[PDB]
Amino acid sequence: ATPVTIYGPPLCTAVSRVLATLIEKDVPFHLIPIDLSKGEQKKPEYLKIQPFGQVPAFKDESITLFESRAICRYICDKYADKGNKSLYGTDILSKANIDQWVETDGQTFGPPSGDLVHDLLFSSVPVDEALIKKNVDKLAKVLDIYEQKLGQTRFLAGDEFSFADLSHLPNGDYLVNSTDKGYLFTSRKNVNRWWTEISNRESWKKVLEMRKNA
Amino acid sequence: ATPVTIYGPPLCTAVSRVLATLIEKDVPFHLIPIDLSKGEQKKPEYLKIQPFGQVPAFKDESITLFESRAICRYICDKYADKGNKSLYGTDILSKANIDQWVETDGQTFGPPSGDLVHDLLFSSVPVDEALIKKNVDKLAKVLDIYEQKLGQTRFLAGDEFSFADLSHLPNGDYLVNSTDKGYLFTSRKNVNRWWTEISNRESWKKVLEMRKNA
Numbered sequence: 001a002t003p004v005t006i007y008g009p010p011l012c013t014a015v016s017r018v019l020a021t022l023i024e025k026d027v028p029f030h031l032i033p034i035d036l037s038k039g040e041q042k043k044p045e046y047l048k049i050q051p052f053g054q055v056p057a058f059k060d061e062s063i064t065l066f067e068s069r070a071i072c073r074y075i076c077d078k079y080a081d082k083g084n085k086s087l088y089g090t091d092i093l094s095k096a097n098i099d100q101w102v103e104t105d106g107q108t109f110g111p112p113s114g115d116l117v118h119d120l121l122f123s124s125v126p127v128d129e130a131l132i133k134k135n136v137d138k139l140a141k142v143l144d145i146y147e148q149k150l151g152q153t154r155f156l157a158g159d160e161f162s163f164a165d166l167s168h169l170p171n172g173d174y175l176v177n178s179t180d181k182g183y184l185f186t187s188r189k190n191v192n193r194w195w196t197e198i199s200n201r202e203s204w205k206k207v208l209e210m211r212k213n214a
Numbered sequence: 215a216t217p218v219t220i221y222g223p224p225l226c227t228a229v230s231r232v233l234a235t236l237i238e239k240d241v242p243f244h245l246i247p248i249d250l251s252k253g254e255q256k257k258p259e260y261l262k263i264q265p266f267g268q269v270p271a272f273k274d275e276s277i278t279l280f281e282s283r284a285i286c287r288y289i290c291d292k293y294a295d296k297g298n299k300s301l302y303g304t305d306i307l308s309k310a311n312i313d314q315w316v317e318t319d320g321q322t323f324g325p326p327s328g329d330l331v332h333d334l335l336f337s338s339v340p341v342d343e344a345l346i347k348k349n350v351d352k353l354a355k356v357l358d359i360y361e362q363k364l365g366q367t368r369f370l371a372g373d374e375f376s377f378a379d380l381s382h383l384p385n386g387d388y389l390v391n392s393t394d395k396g397y398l399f400t401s402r403k404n405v406n407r408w409w410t411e412i413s414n415r416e417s418w419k420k421v422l423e424m425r426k427n428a
């Protein structure tokens with residue numbers, strides 16, 4: 001197989017999402033750097049690839065894709081028979097059952113957690129501590145619902161790790177390990193169990209190792 | 215087959231997304247009301263169906279699902295042979311090509327446009343004109359990119375209507391028809407062409423009618 005091409009730095013949450021997915025699916029890849037600190041993602045040449053001037057972007061022999069969850073769904077389809085076969089289900093029901101919790105990442109967990117990560121770690125503008133308080137409360141109410149769900153099932157969608165869990169890793173990791181908001185996860189028993197299990201998965205450990213080696 | 219069951223009011227954008235998809239896919243359904251003006255979505259029996267206390271929810275003979283886009287992917291999957299057969303593509307590549315624009319709805323267009331609709335039409339608290347402007351500016355930037363894309367293809371993902379276009383209808387229609395931010399769409403000639411084209415589909419007209427008879 002020819003390695004697929006991924007654009008962007010591993011430190012980027014949306015890039016990490018794709019990388020963890022590739023590793024779970026045993027898909028070889030080649031990572032092309034895009035230096036966000038130098039604004040390289042806004043260069044006309046890159047905009048030909050990702051028209052919104054964001055990373056990641058994905059290329060293989062057949063298609064160019066953007067939006068990390070779309071990239072991941074394609075990887076899971078194309079390589080269904082490979083690696084972790086059950087990551088995004090094995091049939092129409094199991095896929096949909098996982099998918100609703102992927103959408104919960106995208107629409108519910110993702111916005112407050114992502115804004116927290118951005119405002120605390122990746123913004124050059126002074127932290128509006130009111131806006132922080134708003135999003136912490138937002139995220140706490142979400143995790144209170146996760147707490148009940150995770151008292152019924154080991155992972156969000158059922159008994160096995162799925163792409164719905166994987167998709168929480170990038171924002172979760174920055175909050176737990178690079179901000180003082182980790183207690184939102186670790187003070188909730190079932191959420192803490194879940195977070196501890198998913199963050200210690202070998203694929204995610206491999207992504208963290210990639211960040212370490214630049 | 216048996217009709218599927220959908221929960222919530224058609225005035226809800228996320229419910230509207232599901233309804234338009236059901237109609238495109240020629241799927242029979244029962245719509246069960248949930249009055250948001252009276253807190254019905256928070257009653258314990260409904261929380262058993264939708265753990266976030268939001269609408270829509272979906273049930274058929276095999277599964278209960280929430281999150282409108284997951285509900286719609288399931289419908290397109292289960293009823294692929296029915297109705298509009300190409301709505302979410304017909305193989306792995308055409309599906310992924312559409313899906314990236316569906317994610318653009320979910321992560322890029324959706325948040326600022328949805329926030330505008332909320333702050334302008336469905337919020338008790340006085341509008342913060344600075345936050346209004348922040349989101350107008352975000353959405354302008356997104357639609358500048360749409361304008362370029364829609365000068366190359368008739369719809370977002372190509373020359374045929376897809377779920378990616380469908381998913382924009384709920385927030386688009388509120389902005390265009392119930393706010394003074396419609397110029398965002400109508401001032402851009404290709405976006406305006408596209409908007410007119412998708413919002414005049416019978417499926418969308420039917421959803422707007424259901425609203426009236428609600």
Ligand SMILES: *SC[C@H](NC(=O)CC[C@H](N)C(=O)O)C(=O)NCC(=O)O
Nearest residue numbers: 012013014053054055056067068321
């Ligand atoms: S992580 C760096 C930023 N990327 C994204 O936010 C990608 C978001 C998409 N919704 C996705 O693929 O999931 C980024 O590119 N920031 C630079 C910028 O100029 O925005």
Ligand SMILES: *SC[C@H](NC(=O)CC[C@H](N)C(=O)O)C(=O)NCC(=O)O
Nearest residue numbers: 107226227228267268269270281282
């Ligand atoms: S449209 C009314 C509200 N629902 C949603 O926002 C659903 C969003 C999901 N991400 C989706 O299914 O797409 C709603 O239910 N408001 C009531 C409330 O108490 O929040």
